């Protein structure tokens, strides 16, 4: 056995278990893991920690012992007598010293040392300075005893600063956090002395680096006087920048220095600010590299430390310049320095590392915005700007990206990525280059024409180069005057066409052509001003739609729909020179045009045509265009509805299911583009489509009932589910975009509900689609205020059965959980009357369902659950001293209070905190604002006429005492007093709750802490 959960402890065996877990593999390592976890979670395990720390031959065992000690210190420290406390404290200091005296251990086991130090810092939080007032003097004194102890002292101080200033919120009560911050500020003169002495006398070494590490953390909070009124600025900016081993951490320190709270009307501080920066830059120039250094090549061939350094350099410059560019600009002697620093960024901007480039680009954006709005200083940075232009043009990223995903039905679907890192980078670059173009149009144009010419002669020809250049050219769209834009676009397109003729290979031609289309798609103004060109492009795209070359068809469809999105008006109007709106021409030949396209590309083409059609404002002509467009799918739909009605077996034919899917998908596409305008088409296929839905759903449910869950994965059921989902998607799409709500209510709602609600109830769980709930959510969102009986039917159909699906655990049917509470929420918003009419038992189930959502370790469910609770309480508040409200309070007020507290005080429900607090405030408000007009108690259990305030207080005190017996009466009383005094202030209330949440995790918390807000 490797079980060490007995009475006597085997240190060797524990080492064995630890070694099995850390160096072992597989099932053994698994068991070892569970064992170690069980041992580590023993309330009494700390009693063994010291023994381990003294006897274990395993560094990891010591680490785990320190973890157990950490638990004891954080949670049950104040249970121990003062004697024992001091004992453990001196045990840890002594152990730390022992480890430091061991040079091997000190250098090779930083992890164990850091754990030790952190354990000490935990003891400091709990003890210092009230019970350990001599700690900082003793620590500084001991610094001389060993170099390792000196270094470790710097680690301990760094850790203490982190715990007190960096990570104190949400780990400590506001009162205790203030106490520790004040304690650490009081004794910082001494700490800074030790620090400065080490920095001033010491030379580059591990101890110096550790000292600077600590200084980095100090800089977050220390007064600027320790930086500006001492010689530390000179030390950092000169001494520690020359020594390689300290450059990076010194830069980090100077980065934070750049961000200090300093006086804004002190000329000496201004000169000091300039001076350290001038020193740092000159020192980098002298010791590291000049402005002329090729940082791109350097970074590429660098060793990671050098890379980090270069990153840190950019962080330094970008921080300092963003704060102090004005300072560097005002005095013309500083000109050479200013430009030099910017030059570094330029060089740093050339480094191929996205995150570093983004860091530089934020600043670049700042600078070019400032120059745009203050063109007086523009000339100073003319040269810098010119180079920046080239940088950005050379480093344009893809403006839009596409993913090919497989959905739950097994379909291969092309989706456009939205709001990605790359897209935000594109947008940032675009804004920077737009600014740059505004600043000097002539320079931007010259650069772009040069890159293009270098593309033509083949000197800089590559797919990536031409793509980048194209993206760049497209990015500055709408910046030049239409005349200048006209000449520019003409040149670019002409050159690119000549390039295409010159390039050999289908690959190369495709690349350049796709670039041509991207560029033209990026300049809608040029297309609108020149119809002939627009037509030529559209036809050329149609021509491309028959090209089998990989990617070309998608390019053509993407360009087409992109161009129409912007230029729709020019398709619906008769452009003289044309005998008919070009939309008619497109619709005429749609069969021929889209013959070679993939299904999804066809759908995109229809979507495009829909965009165009919705531009026609005459209802008659628009409806005709829509009809003409939908003719092919309409006709196949007619022939299919006839055969299906007559022969149900057709839905067994996979070819039919395909055709049906494509028909509904085409409807979805056109409905997407056309919105309310699509209603005629929807009406054309509606009732039949709902029937087909009922059929496909019945078939899915039957087969799943018969075969089990596996059936849901079969190609047959997958195809059928596609049809089901597409139908639901069409309906949701139209209703979401609908304008004429009467027609929705009176024509669409009733058939839809009849079709899908009863089907959903009667489906087997494994066949129910959450999309049904989603569709219902959208219906309720849009017209729920108009369909009270419809909403009631939705509840009656989905509530009990979906609940019963998802109330077994937190894991089964996740999509169902999400959409169920989204629907409950929207119903509660739009048609709360429905919940009013439910029988008492049904309403109880509702409340149970809300509280069920509370307990979910799922953000999607949890937030909706809390929102429902809030909204419900708001809804019932709207009703006055009405028996329903009174009864609801009598039945559920305390349920809601207790459930909210349960999820507040639960370890793992932090996402809902913001909402939880609100709900709690509201509930408390209802009692402390005297807005509940009936006693919330019973039996006269509290004497007649007892105020609901006193009863709420009693209930809360009792409940919290039961839940948390380790809190004192004084703790609970004070917390409740604070809550009941602070229910009108959200931020203070949240503070008080966080204080309580800190205090329930520990024993012997200070009841005064709840007066924190009242104190300030």
């Amino acid at each position: 056995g490797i079980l060490d959960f007995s009475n006597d402890l085997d240190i060797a065996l524990l080492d064995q278990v630890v070694s099995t877990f850390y160096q072992g593999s597989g099932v053994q390592q698994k068991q070892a893991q569970e064992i170690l976890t069980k041992f580590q979670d023993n309330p009494d395990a700390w009693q063994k920690a010291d023994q381990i720390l003294q006897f274990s031959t395993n560094p990891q065992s010591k680490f785990i012992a320190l973890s157990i000690l950490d638990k004891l210190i954080t949670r049950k420290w104040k249970l121990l007598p003062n004697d024992h406390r001091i004992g453990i404290r001196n045990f840890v200091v002594g152990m730390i010293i022992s480890m430091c005296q061991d040079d091997e251990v000190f250098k090779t086991q930083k992890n164990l040392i850091n754990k030790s130090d952190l354990t000490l810092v935990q003891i400091l939080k709990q003890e210092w300075p009230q019970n350990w007032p001599e700690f900082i003097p003793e620590l500084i004194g001991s610094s001389s005893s060993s170099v390792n102890v000196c270094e470790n002292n710097m680690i301990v101080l760094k850790l203490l600063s982190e715990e007190v200033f960096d990570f104190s919120a949400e780990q400590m009560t506001q009162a205790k956090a203030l106490h520790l911050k004040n304690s650490m500020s009081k004794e910082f003169e001494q700490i800074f002395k030790l620090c400065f002495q080490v920095l001033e006398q010491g030379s580059s070494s591990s101890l110096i680096v550790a000292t600077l590490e600590s200084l980095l953390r100090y800089l977050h909070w220390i007064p600027y006087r320790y930086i500006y009124e001492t010689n530390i600025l000179e030390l950092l900016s000169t001494k520690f920048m020359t020594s390689p081993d300290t450059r990076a951490i010194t830069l980090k320190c100077l980065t934070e220095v750049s961000n200090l709270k300093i006086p804004q009307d002190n000329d000496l501080i201004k000169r000091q600010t300039v001076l350290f920066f001038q020193n740092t830059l000159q020192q980098i120039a002298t010791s590291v590299m000049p402005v002329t250094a090729d940082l791109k090549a350097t970074y590429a061939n660098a060793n990671g430390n050098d890379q980090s350094f270069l990153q840190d350099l950019a962080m330094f410059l970008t921080t300092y310049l963003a704060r102090n560019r004005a300072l560097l600009e005002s005095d013309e002697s500083l000109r050479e320095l200013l430009l030099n620093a910017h030059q570094y960024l330029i060089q740093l901007s050339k480094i191929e590392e996205r995150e570093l480039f983004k860091t530089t680009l934020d600043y670049w954006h700042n600078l070019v915005a400032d120059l745009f709005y203050e063109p007086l200083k523009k000339h100073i940075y003319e040269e810098i700007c010119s180079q920046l232009r080239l940088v950005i043009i050379e480093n344009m990223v893809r403006p839009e990206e596409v993913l090919v995903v497989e959905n739950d039905e097994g379909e291969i679907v092309r989706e456009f990525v939205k709001e990605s890192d790359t897209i935000q980078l594109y947008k940032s670059e675009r804004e920077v280059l737009v600014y740059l173009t505004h600043l000097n149009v002539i320079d931007t144009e010259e650069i772009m024409i040069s890159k293009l010419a270098r593309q033509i002669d083949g000197s800089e020809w590559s797919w990536h180069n031409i793509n980048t250049l194209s993206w760049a050219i497209g990015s500055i769209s709408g910046t030049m005057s239409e005349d200048t834009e006209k000449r520019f676009v003409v040149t670019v397109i002409k050159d690119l066409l000549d390039l295409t003729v010159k390039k050999r290979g289908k690959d190369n031609k495709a690349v350049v052509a796709s670039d041509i289309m991207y560029v033209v798609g990026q300049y809608p103004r040029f297309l609108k001003a020149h119809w002939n060109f627009l037509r030529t492009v559209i036809l050329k795209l149609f021509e491309f739609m028959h090209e089998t070359h990989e990617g070309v068809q998608d390019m053509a469809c993407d360009t087409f729909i992109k161009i129409v999105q912007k230029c729709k008006y020019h398709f619906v109007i008769q452009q003289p020179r044309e005998s008919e709106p070009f939309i008619q021409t497109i619709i005429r030949d749609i069969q021929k045009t889209t013959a070679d396209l993939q299904p999804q590309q066809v759908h995109t083409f229809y979507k495009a045509c829909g965009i165009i059609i919705s531009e026609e404002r005459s209802v008659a002509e628009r409806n005709r265009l829509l009809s003409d467009l939908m003719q092919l799918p309409n006709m196949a739909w007619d022939t299919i509805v006839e055969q299906s009605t007559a022969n149900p077996t057709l839905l067994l034919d996979s070819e039919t299911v395909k055709i049906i899917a494509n028909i509904i998908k085409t409807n979805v596409a056109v409905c997407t583009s056309m919105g309310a305008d699509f209603y005629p088409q929807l009406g054309h296929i509606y009732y039949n489509m709902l029937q087909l839905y009922r059929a496909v759903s019945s078939m899915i449910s039957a087969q799943v009932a018969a075969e089990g869950l596996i059936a849901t994965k079969t190609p047959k059921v997958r195809g059928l589910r596609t049809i089901k989902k597409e139908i639901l998607k069409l309906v949701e799409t139209y209703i979401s975009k609908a304008r004429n709500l009467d027609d929705v209510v009176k024509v669409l709602v009733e058939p839809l509900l009849n079709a899908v609600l009863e089907d959903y109830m009667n489906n087997v769980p494994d066949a129910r689609d959450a999309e049904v709930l989603n569709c219902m959510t959208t219906v309720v969102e849009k017209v729920g205020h108009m369909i009270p009986q419809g909403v009631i039917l939705i509840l009656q159909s989905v509530f009990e059965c979906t609940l019963d699906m998802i109330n077994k655990d937190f894991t089964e049917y996740p999509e169902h959980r999400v959409e169920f509470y989204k629907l409950l929420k929207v119903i509660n918003e739009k048609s709360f009357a429905a919940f009013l009419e439910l029988p008492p038992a049904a309403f109880k189930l509702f409340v149970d369902a809300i509280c069920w959502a509370f307990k979910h370790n799922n953000r999607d469910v949890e937030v909706n659950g809390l929102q429902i609770a809030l909204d419900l309480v708001k809804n019932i508040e709207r009703m006055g001293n009405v028996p329903f409200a009174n009864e609801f309070h009598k039945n559920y007020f305390f349920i809601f209070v207790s459930e909210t507290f349960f999820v507040l005080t639960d370890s793992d429900h932090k996402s809902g905190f913001s909402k939880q607090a609100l709900l709690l405030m509201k509930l408390i408000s209802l009692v402390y604002d005297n807005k509940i007009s009936v006693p919330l108690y019973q039996e006269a259990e509290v004497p007649q006429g007892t105020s609901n305030q006193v009863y709420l207080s009693q209930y809360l005190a009792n409940m919290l005492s039961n839940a948390f017996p380790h809190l004192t009466s004084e703790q609970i009383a004070s917390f409740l007093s604070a809550l009941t005094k602070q229910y009108k202030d959200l931020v203070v209330f949240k503070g008080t709750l966080r204080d309580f949440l800190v205090q329930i995790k520990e024993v012997g918390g200070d009841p005064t802490d709840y007066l924190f807000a009242e104190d300030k």
Partner: peptide, 16 residues
């Protein structure tokens, strides 16, 4: 002329 000539060139755009 110049836009029209662009149209002609655009029309001739080929991937072969």
């Amino acid at each position: 002329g110049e836009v029209d000539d662009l149209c002609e060139l655009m029309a001739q755009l080929s991937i072969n």
